[PDB]
Amino acid sequence: LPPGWEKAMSRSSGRVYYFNHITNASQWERPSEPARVRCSHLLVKHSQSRRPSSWRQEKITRTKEEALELINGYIQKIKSGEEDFESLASQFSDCSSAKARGDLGAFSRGQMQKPFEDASFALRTGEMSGPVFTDSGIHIILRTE
Amino acid sequence: FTXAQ
Numbered sequence: 804l805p806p807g808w809e810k811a812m813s814r815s816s817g818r819v820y821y822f823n824h825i826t827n828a829s830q831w832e833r834p835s836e837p838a839r840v841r842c843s844h845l846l847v848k849h850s851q852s853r854r855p856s857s858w859r860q861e862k863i864t865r866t867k868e869e870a871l872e873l874i875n876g877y878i879q880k881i882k883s884g885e886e887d888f889e890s891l892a893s894q895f896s897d898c899s900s901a902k903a904r905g906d907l908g909a910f911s912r913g914q915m916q917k918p919f920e921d922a923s924f925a926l927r928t929g930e931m932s933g934p935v936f937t938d939s940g941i942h943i944i945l946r947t948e
Numbered sequence: 949f950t951x952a953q
Contacts, residue, residue, distance in 0.1 A: 846950065854950070898950050916951045939951045 807925050808834050825925040826944070827933025835927065841948035842923045843888065843905035847873050848897040848940035857897035867941070874934045874941045881931065881943070888931065888945050897940060909948065919944065 807825035849870040880886040892905030916937040926946035
């Protein structure tokens, strides 16, 4: 299996699935490094974020647990097709990159907060992470290039 | 700045 994958079993159904402990992605199918990658993200900040403020809200007071619930809801809507990643990033990301549909542009190793870097480089082109935790908050990451 | 090291 590609970098970071393990076989698991659904607790609700018993069917095998795959989980990546670097990106926090999970998928039903058996999964299918670059010098630079391009990613977009959606950040949900919380009260313990390094800087608990964003363009959305001057004082961010939500708990980390509440932030994770929000992230999980956005992931659901993105996976179902009810909403686009880009639309949710524009509306709800606690980062000024929201104004660019979450796009951060291209970057190499040695630039980003480490859990974000590692997730970004472990994603395949077009793939989306699960919740990724950094000192900034909790991210959904989409690798675009 | 967010989310740079």
